[PDB]
Structure 1
Amino acid sequence: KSRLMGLEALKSHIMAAKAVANTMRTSLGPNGLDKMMVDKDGDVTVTNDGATILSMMDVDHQIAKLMVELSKSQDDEIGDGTTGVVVLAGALLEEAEQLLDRGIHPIRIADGYEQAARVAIEHLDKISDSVLVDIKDTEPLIQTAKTTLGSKVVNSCHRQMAEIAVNAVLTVADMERRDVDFELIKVEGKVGGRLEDTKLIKGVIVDKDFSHPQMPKKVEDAKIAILTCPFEPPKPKTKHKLDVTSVEDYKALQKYEKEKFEEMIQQIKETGANLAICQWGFDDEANHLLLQNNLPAVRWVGGPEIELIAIATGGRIVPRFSELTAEKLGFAGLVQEISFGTTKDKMLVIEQCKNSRAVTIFIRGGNKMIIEEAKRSLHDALCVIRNLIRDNRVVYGGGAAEISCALAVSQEADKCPTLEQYAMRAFADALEVIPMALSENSGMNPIQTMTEVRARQVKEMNPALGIDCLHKGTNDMKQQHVIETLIGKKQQISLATQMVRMILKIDDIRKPGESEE
């Protein structure tokens, strides 16, 4: 049995954590550097967004396991700082450690970090503006959704993705609460186009069942028929072969399909669309004979899809042929059949104004990894406004806010004294570590560029201008247009200052001898 004492556990918790924290701090900003992922299979992928890459990273060490779990709740509400929490959660870490190695209790300064976290929050909440609106946010969202794409996937602004990312939110932002959730719009990766090729859709879309291209591709009404029941004769993922008692009975079999096509087209016709969304992909030899009866059936698409596209309209799926009902059929403001990619077939585009419980931005890319990180772009540009929806709020800096956030916490240390002065010592500096650690991964001295805004924070307060994430010569967090929700920074603090305290939870570091295996 292994028995660690105090720092020993901590020191054991220090090893990979800072090393993991080290990989974060060179990822900070465009100054920072992406984290490549080579899988357990050896799959080589450039990635980011710590919880993402920390999910790709295999967490054996304990403290890293929360780094996946902590940063999870970080990415959801915020979208950024997931790579930045482990920075501070690694930065504030050896803050306490050296204090613990200065003889300072975990009983002592650990509260002081949260106690300095609130006041840094309290300080942060002043920095820049807790205020935005559905109009203002757009420009922060522009400089978000330009750079969110313009960091991960490309460095350029792609507008059709940029504001469609924010308007997708803005489309379901006002659907609920004046607050969207992160599922309440969806990002659907498929590549038929380039990156810039995308589909903003107020409902979910799929590639329509095509049992032959030459058969007419049609779309009608506003509405769709979402079908567990037969749209035409259903097929239950099972072959049906040709058995007819006579050579004439085969051609007599031919009518059975087409008549049951239009009959159950007519049975779908009155109810919704003329089109299927059918939980059963039916015989594609027969399906294109119904595509020869036209009114295209969408079939051979997931059983979860009929569920999906139904609920996305707030509707249902018709379970039985006798159960056919317009409400048991899905909806849309417009169902349209639109080409997926430029050259390929026309995917059924279901744009749902009869409800939108997910407004799906559909995205195309030259490649996955770019459309991925364009998706992975959108998600953050989607997440940052998920802060904005709740409080329309932002801030400018990690090298403006924090050095200023620290500046309050700075002398507040000796305003503390006894216990948490060494905390708000070790807190304030740990804040300025991020502009340091970003100036680190910048081409600049992490001390001097931190000294830069240090002098500036000895001058300007609550600065809209702070060090360079965008790696410019001028450092203006407003005009670097590094834009982060003051909710997020606040939540990040709450989340980043969190883990370090949590390793102190109870007095038991006690293991049977296995704390990792």
Structure 2
Amino acid sequence: MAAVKTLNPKAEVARAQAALAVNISAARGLQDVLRTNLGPKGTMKMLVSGAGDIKLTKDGNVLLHEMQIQHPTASLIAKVATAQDDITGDGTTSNVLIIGELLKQADLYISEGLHPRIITEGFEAAKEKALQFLEEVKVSREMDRETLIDVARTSLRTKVHAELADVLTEAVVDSILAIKKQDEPIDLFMIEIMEMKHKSETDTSLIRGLVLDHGARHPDMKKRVEDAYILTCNVSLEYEKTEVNSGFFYKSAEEREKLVKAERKFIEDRVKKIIELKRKVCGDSDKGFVVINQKGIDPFSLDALSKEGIVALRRAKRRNMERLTLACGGVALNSFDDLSPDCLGHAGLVYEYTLGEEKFTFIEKCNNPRSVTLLIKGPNKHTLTQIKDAVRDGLRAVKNAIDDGCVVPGAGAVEVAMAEALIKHKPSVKGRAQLGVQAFADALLIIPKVLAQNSGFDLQETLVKIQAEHSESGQLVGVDLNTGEPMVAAEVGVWDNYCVKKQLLHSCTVIATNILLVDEIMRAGMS
């Protein structure tokens, strides 16, 4: 039917207008699905795997990867959203919406015989002006707990219910404001995230310490320790066989017994070193001693340590080494060669919690822990997953607001203002790229439009009200989701991340430009 089909007969090909139609249709389909995710008045979608597992989500990235879609354009847009999420944590739904709306507004003019190249030139011009307007309107603010609370609220209220969002706000802001060192990039790995499935979802809390998902495997070991010395080690305390294939040779049962007693001398010695440190640092039963090993501990070592009153947990996570040395304050060891009391941390409380078949170990009352944990409590696996996604969004939001000390008004305010600025900038553009600029502006305008659509208001009336209020006053205004009226986003505490807005502008412009310039989709790698 074409050039490619003469060489590879089983080839699929979409040329010029057909390719544009394919791509824009897929973009419009994704937008139609994701339009409802935007904002707190959005609706939660339920997603059932092929196994029957349930996901409750409002997150654009989760919904994309979970929808059942096989379109190449959808793959492109899913990857763009995945990059948005990997780098910023939020902005995926808005990413998809702006991509779809740029494509639609460009089709508006390409159907009128305009070439897509000129629309892409207008896109590039509008990108420049919009990035300028963004840097101009950004609010550089000293990141106080109140500002960070408002930011995390703006994110968590979109991702979860209002009461749970008001809880996760305090949890997330305190977590970051605790693991944060003055002028030193925030390592979010230092916020462990443990989920428990027993109580209500509003019990989700911040443990100013650590929660390990395992406990002691010796029953005689204490289940509660008050003033605890924590020894974080990465040393095998179980039987290790020789690398060189040694084997034992004996001529008598007594010699066999001697070899059985001897084959463990190597590990008995390390256990003895631990026990000697314990005795030297807490000569009485007043304080406690907690060993946390990244490697194993055999029953003999567990017995030897219990007899001396030590609580030993084994096979912890490679990240818990750093999290415990930063929370408690010791040193993680790969050998007990020369160990000193300075290698120990302190925890004002260590205890154990049994939940059904699993055990948890809490390490709390640390002095000034640079590592904490968020305990996600909830009654259902899907509730826990939803709260995990929400806290990821909120942590990324607060981290970005701190890193980029600036913060941008929300509720589509920046989009409205950038559209007005682009429309006032249009005459300075030479030729018919002014239409690309117009397309960029009306595409940027999809965020307030969809917010209105989801709060249950008329898009056109609300948008004219908002643009009128912004032109007469100049106050950066957005949508009030309870009245449909314009409101000052900076005054009501609706904040967005400058980094997120910039990433939106850049990535959306780039992917939309590259899609519009596609003139042939081709699958010919068959046979």
Q: Is the TM value for this pair above 0.5?
A: yes
Q: Who is 2:135 aligned against?
A: 125
Match of 1:347 among 332, 352, 361: 361
Q: TM-score, normalised by structure 1?
A: 0.81
Partner of residue 511 from structure 1, selected from 512, 517, 522:
522
Matched with 2:212 is 206
Task: Tell me which residue corresponds to 2:454.
Answer: 441
Which of 374, 378, 399 matches 2:391?
378
Q: 3-state SS of the aligned residue for 2:496?
A: coil
Give the match for residue 406 of structure 1.
419
Distance in 2, Cα, partners of 1:202 & 1:308? 12
User: For the aligned residues, what is the CA RMSD?
Assistant: 4.0
Distance in 2 (alpha carbons) for counterparts of 1:456 and 1:383 = 32
Q: Which stretch has the larger CA shift, 386-395 or 332-341?
A: 332-341
Specify whether residues 323 and 142 from structure 1 end up closer, same or farther in structure 2 by C-alpha distance, changes over 3 A only.
same
Ranges in structure 1 where 5+ consecutive residues have no aligned partner = 237-244
Whether contact under 8 Å (1:336, 1:350) holds in the other structure is yes
CA distance in 2, matches of 1:75, 1:351: 34
> Any conservation in 2 of the 1:229–1:324 contact (CA below 8 Å)?
no
**How many Å apart are 1:341 and its aligned residue?**
7.8
Change in 2 beyond 3 A, CA 1:336/1:326? farther
Distance in 1 separating the partners of 2:184 and 2:384: 29
Aligned ranges 1:119-198 → 2 under 5 Å: 119-127=129-137, 129-135=138-144, 138-156=145-163, 161-174=168-181, 177-198=183-204
Separation of aligned partners in 2, 1:139 and 1:474: 25
Hey, what does 1:298 align to over in structure 2?
Answer: 313
1:361 aligns with 2:374: yes
1:177-326 paired onto structure 2 within 5 Å: 177-198=183-204, 200=206, 204-211=210-217, 215-217=221-223, 218=225, 220-221=227-228, 223-230=230-237, 233=238, 263-266=272-275, 269=278, 274-283=289-298, 287=302, 290-302=305-317, 318-319=333-334, 323=337, 325=339
What is the CA-CA distance between 1:181 and the residue it aligns to?
4.3
1:420 aligns with 2:430: no
Cα displacement (A) at 1:49: 1.9
The question of whether the paired residues in 2 share the 8 Å contact of 1:332 and 1:353 is answered with: no
Structure whose CA Rg is larger: 2
Does 2:472 align with 1:459? yes
* Superposed displacement of residue 90, structure 1: 0.8
Whole-Å separation in 2 of the counterparts to 1:442 and 1:421: 32
C-alpha distance in 2 between matches for 1:144 and 1:371: 22
3-state secondary structure, aligned to 1:4: strand
CA shift at 1:390, angstroms?
2.2
Query: Which amino acid is 1:170 matched to?
Result: L
Task: Give the superposition deviation at 1:25.
Answer: 1.5
Structure 1 pair 159–212 and aligned structure 2 pair: CA distance change class (3 A): farther
Instruction: Name the SS for the 2:472 alignment partner.
Output: coil
Structure-1 separation of matches of 2:522 and 2:167: 54
Structure in which a larger fraction of residues adopt helix: 2
- One-letter code of the match for 1:180? I
- Of the candidates 3, 25, 30, which is equivalent to residue 40 of structure 2? 30
Q: Does 1:61 align with 2:71?
A: yes
Taking the aligned partners of 2:359 and 2:186, their CA distance within structure 1 comes to 32
Letter in 1 for 2:73: I
Q: 2:513 aligns with which of 485, 497, 501?
A: 501
From the superposition, tell whether residues 48 and 330 of structure 1 become closer, same or farther in structure 2 (CA, over 3 Å).
farther
Question: Aligned-pair distance for 1:355?
Answer: 8.2
Q: CA deviation at 1:408?
A: 0.9
1:159 to 1:291, Cα distance in 2 relative to 1, 3 A:
farther
- SS of the residue aligned with 1:296? strand
Are the aligned partners of 2:191 and 2:374 in contact in 1 as well (CA < 8 Å)? yes
Q: Which whole-Å CA distance do the structure 2 matches of 1:352 and 1:57 have between them?
A: 44
Between the aligned partners of 1:161 and 1:462, the Cα distance in structure 2 is 30
Distance in 2 separating the partners of 1:341 and 1:395 = 45
Letter in 2 for 1:347: T
- The alignment partner of 1:40 has SS state of coil
Asked if 1 retains the 8 angstrom alpha-carbon contact of 2:217 and 2:313, the reply is: no
Shifted more, 156-165 versus 50-59: the winner is 156-165
State the partner residue of 1:488: 500
Q: CA deviation at 1:160?
A: 5.6
Distance 1:102 1:457, change over 3 A: same
Assess, with a 3 A threshold, how the Cα gap between structure 1 residues 315 and 13 changes in structure 2: closer, same or farther.
farther
Structure 1 residue 86: Cα displacement: 0.3
How far does the alpha carbon of each residue in 1:410-458 deviate from its partner, in whole angstroms, 9 at most, with x for none? 2333442413200111111111122112222221111111122122223
* Aligned amino acid, residue 189 of structure 1: E
The percent of aligned pairs where both chains have the same amino acid is 27
The alpha-carbon deviation at position 353 of structure 1 amounts to 7.3
Q: Which moved more, 1:305-314 or 1:114-123?
A: 305-314
Aligned residue pairs: how many? 492
Q: Deviations over 1:369-394 (max 9, x none)?
A: 33332222222221122222222122
- Partner secondary structure for residue 95 of structure 2: helix
Indicate conservation of the 8 Å contact 2:228/2:290, yes or no: no
- Alignment counterpart, residue 24 of structure 2, candidates 11, 14, 24: 14
Alignment-mate amino acid for residue 460 of structure 2: I
Task: Answer yes or no: is the 8 Å Cα contact 2:466–2:485 preserved in 1.
Answer: no
Q: More strand by proportion, 1 or 2?
A: 2
